[PDB]
Structure formats: C-alpha cells, structure tokens
Enzyme design. Sequence first.
Site, PDB file in Angstrom:
ATOM      1  N   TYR A  96     -32.282   1.961  -4.855  1.00 27.79           N
ATOM      2  CA  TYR A  96     -33.358   2.831  -4.377  1.00 27.79           C
ATOM      3  C   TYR A  96     -34.362   2.064  -3.572  1.00 27.79           C
ATOM      4  O   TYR A  96     -34.509   0.847  -3.656  1.00 27.79           O
ATOM      5  CB  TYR A  96     -34.075   3.480  -5.587  1.00 27.79           C
ATOM      6  N   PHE A  98     -43.263   0.565  -1.803  1.00 25.89           N
ATOM      7  CA  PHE A  98     -43.793  -0.015  -3.040  1.00 25.89           C
ATOM      8  C   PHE A  98     -42.703  -0.658  -3.924  1.00 25.89           C
ATOM      9  O   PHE A  98     -43.052  -1.381  -4.875  1.00 25.89           O
ATOM     10  CB  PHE A  98     -44.642   0.968  -3.871  1.00 25.89           C
ATOM     11  N   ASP A  99     -41.415  -0.369  -3.665  1.00 28.60           N
ATOM     12  CA  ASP A  99     -40.367  -0.947  -4.502  1.00 28.60           C
ATOM     13  C   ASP A  99     -39.049  -0.750  -3.765  1.00 28.60           C
ATOM     14  O   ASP A  99     -38.852   0.168  -2.980  1.00 28.60           O
ATOM     15  CB  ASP A  99     -40.386  -0.289  -5.861  1.00 28.60           C
ATOM     16  N   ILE A 119     -39.490   7.694 -14.441  1.00 36.15           N
ATOM     17  CA  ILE A 119     -40.309   8.905 -14.208  1.00 36.15           C
ATOM     18  C   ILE A 119     -39.473  10.165 -14.322  1.00 36.15           C
ATOM     19  O   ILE A 119     -38.246  10.183 -14.110  1.00 36.15           O
ATOM     20  CB  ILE A 119     -41.061   8.803 -12.862  1.00 36.15           C
ATOM     21  N   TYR A 156     -46.271   9.335 -11.721  1.00 34.44           N
ATOM     22  CA  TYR A 156     -47.196   8.529 -12.513  1.00 34.44           C
ATOM     23  C   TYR A 156     -48.536   9.239 -12.734  1.00 34.44           C
ATOM     24  O   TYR A 156     -49.457   8.641 -13.315  1.00 34.44           O
ATOM     25  CB  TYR A 156     -47.414   7.146 -11.878  1.00 34.44           C
ATOM     26  N   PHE A 197     -38.556   8.798  -2.537  1.00 35.93           N
ATOM     27  CA  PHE A 197     -37.481   7.874  -2.858  1.00 35.93           C
ATOM     28  C   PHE A 197     -36.239   8.212  -2.068  1.00 35.93           C
ATOM     29  O   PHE A 197     -35.870   9.375  -1.899  1.00 35.93           O
ATOM     30  CB  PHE A 197     -37.071   7.891  -4.343  1.00 35.93           C
TER      31      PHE A 197
END
Length: 128
Positions: A45, A55-56, A75, A101, A118
């Site tokens: 991902y 962010f990731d 999540i 979140y 995502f």
Amino acid sequence: GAPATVTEQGEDITSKKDRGVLKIVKRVGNGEETPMIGDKVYVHYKGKLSNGKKFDSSHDRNEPFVFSLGKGQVIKAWDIGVATMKKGEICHLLCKPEYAYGSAGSLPKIPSNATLFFEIELLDFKGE
C-alpha cells in the site's frame, strides 16, 4: 487526480451506507474468492493525506504489511475494504476519519479529522 476521482466516482462499501469508505477497483484480481475473517492477509500500500503528502508506503520498505483480517489490527476502512478484495486486486480507498484515525489522528503525520487516500494491492491471503 486519483484522490479526487475516488471521492467523486467511488462506490460506498460501508454496511451503513454512510459513504465513509469509497472504493474503485483499479486492477482486477483472480477468481471470485475474497479473504475471510481471521485470515492472514498480505498487502502492499501507499497512503496520502488530503494535503497531497505521502504518509506511508510498504513498497518503500521492501516488505508487505501483514495483519489478520477483521480483528481491528488496522483502521476500520482497511478491515472493510480488504475484505472486498480478490487476490491480485489493486484498489483505491477514500476513508473518512470515522473509518480511520478520527479526532485523535496518529503521530507523526496524520492530523486530527483526516480523510485518507490509499492504494492497496492484496498480495495473498491464507487461513492459519
């Protein structure tokens, strides 16, 4: 771009029909079977904030992210969304904060009340 497109053109996959998690299938996967609750799922991902920043990314780590489906180890949008995927599928998910979140956010980079984008690839799934 892709976040805008899933926001405007995605399918609501929530059981409450509250448009909290919207999905587009980008690459069609294999067969008809989706994982079941408790399976070990392997994903790649990347996530972006609504300010455009990454962010990731598992790709950047050279290893998949592995979790047991439907157990709240990720999540809510991921438990809901990955449960809809076929092996080999790539999708986009647009996740309102109530399925991510929330008001808390997540340090270091996810603010309070954040809508998240995502791209997720379901690599494999297997029962234990």
